[PDB]
Design a binder for this molecule. Structure first.
Ligand SMILES: Nc1nc2c(ncn2[C@@H]2O[C@H](COP(=O)(O)OP(=O)(O)O)[C@@H](O)[C@H]2O)c(=O)[nH]1
Ligand SMILES: [K+]
Length: 306
């Protein structure tokens, strides 16, 4: 069984993350671009491009009207179903607040879930300087996303203001937000790709993300002494997340290292995750021994059950 992963960007921000992720390099992952704006769709790097609402918008965007984005997605449902067909897992990424992403993303996610695919949502909330009316429209879209996905990850754009200095280019900040989705997809792709000493597969991912709600996906790489503890702290500690690790009652943790991987340091990483959750976590533990890795360790964490 080779799992089919698809990343679908809905709207301007979602299709921007898709384009940037394609530049960074992402194989075995098929990309789908959905948008009402034909101008931006023509500039997409994705192999599957779907233009919605051409009759409602005449090629333009939703003009901040979520109703238009929702109607455009439903009118093009069969075109979305065809592009998704065959996918075992789908990542719907979109920026909430606008018309297309706010109204179309929940429709694309509902279609994916009804297509029988594991549907994960990675959406952003608008900056506070964009106004309160846009934060309210984004909340409705977030609530609509949570009802149509198996698992949801919200990234408030204000958190970007915490990881930047006064000169950080805006594009460099957006790339930090893109890492949440990209590395979460790569971690899942790597898990299904290699057979581990303590093996986890796509069935484990389904059991941890199926019909849960909020979730956290993080990866952490470290070296030297205390690498296990430091890697685990990086995988669960992200300043861009609305849903933290605290309160998680279900975790899928995979530690990847060389032949030096110690049982003692594996328990350290697990304890770090459970202690940080401050809950009695139902954990699914896996271990992969990559002899190429020298003194570096990788901790992948998928946390749900909030
Ligand atoms: N982090 C991030 N947020 C974005 C990006 N592009 C747009 N957004 C956010 O997404 C919201 C909706 O914008 P957009 O997706 O382009 O509108 P739409 O195409 O009509 O859905 C905006 O309020 C932005 O705050 C991006 O590249 N990165
Ligand atoms: K595996």
């Amino acid at each position: 069984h080779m799992a089919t992963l698809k990343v679908i960007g809905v709207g301007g921000g979602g299709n921007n993350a898709v384009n940037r992720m394609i530049d960074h390099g992402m194989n075995n992952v098929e990309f789908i671009a959905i948008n009402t704006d034909g101008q931006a769709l023509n500039l997409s790097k994705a192999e599957s491009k779907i233009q919605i609402g051409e009759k409602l918008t005449r090629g333009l965007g939703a003009g901040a009207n979520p109703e238009i984005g929702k109607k455009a997605a439903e009118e093009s449902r069969e075109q979305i179903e065809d592009a998704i067909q065959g996918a075992d897992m789908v990542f719907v990424t979109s920026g909430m607040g606008g018309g297309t992403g706010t109204g179309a993303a929940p429709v694309v996610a509902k279609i994916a879930k009804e297509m029988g695919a594991l549907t994960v949502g990675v959406v952003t909330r608008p900056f506070s300087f964009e106004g309160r009316k846009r934060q309210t429209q984004a909340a409705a879209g977030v609530e609509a996303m949570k009802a149509a996905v198996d698992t949801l990850i919200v990234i408030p754009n204000d958190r970007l203001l915490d990881i930047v200095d006064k000169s950080t280019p805006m594009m460099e900040a957006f790339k930090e937000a893109d890492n949440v989705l990209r590395q979460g997809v790569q971690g899942i792709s790597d898990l299904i790709a290699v057979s581990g000493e303590v093996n986890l597969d796509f069935a484990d991912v389904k059991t941890i993300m199926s019909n849960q709600g909020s979730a956290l996906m993080g990866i952490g790489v470290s070296s030297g002494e205390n690498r296990a503890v430091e890697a685990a702290k990086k995988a669960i500690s992200s300043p861009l997340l609305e849903t933290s690790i605290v309160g998680a009652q279900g975790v899928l943790m995979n530690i990847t290292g060389g032949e030096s991987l110690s049982l003692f340091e594996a328990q350290e990483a697990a304890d770090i995750v459970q202690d940080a959750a401050d809950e009695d976590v139902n954990m699914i533990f896996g271990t992969v021994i990559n002899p190429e890795l020298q003194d570096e360790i990788v901790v992948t964490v998928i946390a749900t059950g909030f």
